């Protein structure tokens, strides 16, 4: 009744390049209203997804805005005509904020260079959830990065056995989950880590290489690994990074190669914006590049094959999906800075419980 | 059986860029031994294509060597498990000679860039052509142009009732085929010329605008010229030029976009090789490029679909496919020029009646 107290990291500064991450968000004790509309909703924060892709939404966001991000809440309060009632656990867009209110409604995000949607909130069902595939995967393997996966897996690339595939940035859980089904439809799988230890994780997971692009900084040296990595050439490569490690992969692509372009770190973070024209080199291969945008995805039939197809071989020990939860709201910002700095010590997902 | 006198067009010199013509070849008279294996043939050249393309063929070749080139033939004189009877037409590569020998059988472009195998031998059957699809069109629309822009269009790209497209190189036999399957889907059909009448023709072939690159160098003025022709963004996109021209069409790629990649102009000839990446360009749209390499559809099945098809259309003047024929074997080099020139004669395919 009335109002309360919350919690915001807001976007204090625009700063371009690897994120500064405690110069650029700026803690807030926000006032919220808590009269509600016909169809809004009062939501507590559980957990937020903290990804390298924030970096472009924060670029985005105008000055004194939380910063949004992938997040599961909890109902405190619902409208009358609300889309979900007290006590439901959702899926959706909350950004890193303690409470906020909500119609839930799929919105437009205005201020984008792309007309971006972010969709409406998925409803969860916690007796989905048990110790072996906890609520707090609607983030991972079962939310957002495991839909990009299995989407890109299903609905885009068919993987033969005997294919050689690449997947850069396999160290996240995209990337790692990518690989295992590769190497499930027996192919395969090669990829790239930044530390000896990450190398030996995936190693243990099945893929049949990984790569230090830290030791690999112009794409001949990068060449160079591939040629070794990839002796029969590329068949299918999931990217997530660009500049120079792409550059190299387009130069040994066989025919019928498939590429899901899912994110361009080089472009993005390191603002590689000027390369050696890829185009040209996929012709003879007749390649097929796709762009990755997982939201076309998040379709409700859709979320339940996730479910029923990836959850249970998730349980079964079988499809492996680390998360590696930070506790507390304040320490926010830092998680999102070890994605850019720290992330020899991160195992899969990286969330924080709030 | 003794031997014989040819004429052959001849690599005389490698030149990088818009070739030289009468510089690079050279007329040769070589004697031919007429021994015949037991699957070899006699050929005699009636008509011999020129495409852009064979600026790469060209420096791909030995100095010395004749040079390669889309031709129709005629046994004279076969071996006994011959693939074709004499007096049979066939359609190959038989390159700027009068005569050769040849068994017909694939063989591979080793010296490549890319290792290319080209197709075995295609016997053209007279039912097929007549007074308004003659002969020569098994070089053009009833051949390898004709097959690249339907084999895009069928087995490619879905064009919808409504969709913007856009064809670089509009003014060639591939793009003017290509633009006019669009305009027949519903498609609002832009292009690119470099003359006030090309620009026009194209026009009356159904053109719904047209750009002069000529006049836009930039990507920045492109954008312009592209903004305004394409109000709506770009559904689909057939590349036969890229640079600045490309890089303008992914600055508005639609959503669930269409490219075919089928020649890069501007990288083969003008060299332009580094430029903006594009991929960043692609993930939102959900773009999925795709190479182009027409020999992939060399099969009967699909020749008579296409004479089934484009045939049809064309015969009934619903397709216009117009054809430059030069005549004579030794205007071959100079009937090459004319592309890579101002030259509103430059109308439909070049040919070179022999
Ligand atoms: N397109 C879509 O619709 C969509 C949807 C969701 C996510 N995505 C994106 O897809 C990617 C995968 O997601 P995720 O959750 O698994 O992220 P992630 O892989 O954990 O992202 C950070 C990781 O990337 C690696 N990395 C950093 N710089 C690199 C470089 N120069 N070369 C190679 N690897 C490098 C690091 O692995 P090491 O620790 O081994 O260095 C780091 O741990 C993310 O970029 C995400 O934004 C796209
Ligand atoms: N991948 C495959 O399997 C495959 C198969 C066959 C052909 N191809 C290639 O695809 C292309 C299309 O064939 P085509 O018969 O239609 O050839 P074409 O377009 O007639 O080739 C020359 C024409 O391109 C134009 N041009 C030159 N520079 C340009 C620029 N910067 N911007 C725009 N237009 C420019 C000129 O048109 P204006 O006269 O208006 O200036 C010129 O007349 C050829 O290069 C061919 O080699 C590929
Ligand atoms: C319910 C949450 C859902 C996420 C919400 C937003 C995320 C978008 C981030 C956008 C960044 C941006 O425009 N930055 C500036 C442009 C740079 C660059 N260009 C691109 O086209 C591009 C991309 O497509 C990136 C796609 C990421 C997809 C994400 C969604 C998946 C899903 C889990 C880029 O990042």
Known sequence: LGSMKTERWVVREHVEG???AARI??????????????????????YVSVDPYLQGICLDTPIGDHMGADSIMQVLDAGPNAPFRPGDLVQGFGGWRTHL???????????????????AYRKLDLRHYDDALPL??????????GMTAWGTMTKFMQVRPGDTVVVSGASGMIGTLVGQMAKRAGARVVGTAGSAG??????????????????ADDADKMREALREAAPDGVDKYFDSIGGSVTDAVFSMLNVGSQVAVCWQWATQVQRDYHGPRLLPYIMFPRATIRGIF????????????????????????????????????????????TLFSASESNRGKVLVRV
């Open 18 to 20: 690897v994120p500064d």
């Open 25 to 46: 968000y700026e803690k807030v004790e926000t006032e919220l209203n808590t009269r509600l509309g016909e169809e809004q909703m009062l939501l507590k924060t559980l």
């Open 101 to 119: 209110v909500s119609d839930g409604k799929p919105k437009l995000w205005q201020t984008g260079t792309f007309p971006m949607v972010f969709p």
């Open 136 to 145: 707090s995967t609607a983030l991972g393997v079962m939310g957002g990065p």
């Open 198 to 215: 990450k190398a030996r994780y995936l190693s243990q997971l099945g893929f049949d290489a990984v790569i230090d692009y830290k030791l």
């Open 294 to 337: 997982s939201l076309e995805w998040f379709t409700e039939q859709n979320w339940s094959a996730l479910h029923e197809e990836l959850g249970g071989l998730v349980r079964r020990q079988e499809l492996v999906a680390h998360e590696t939860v930070q506790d507390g709201f304040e320490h926010i910002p830092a998680a999102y800075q």
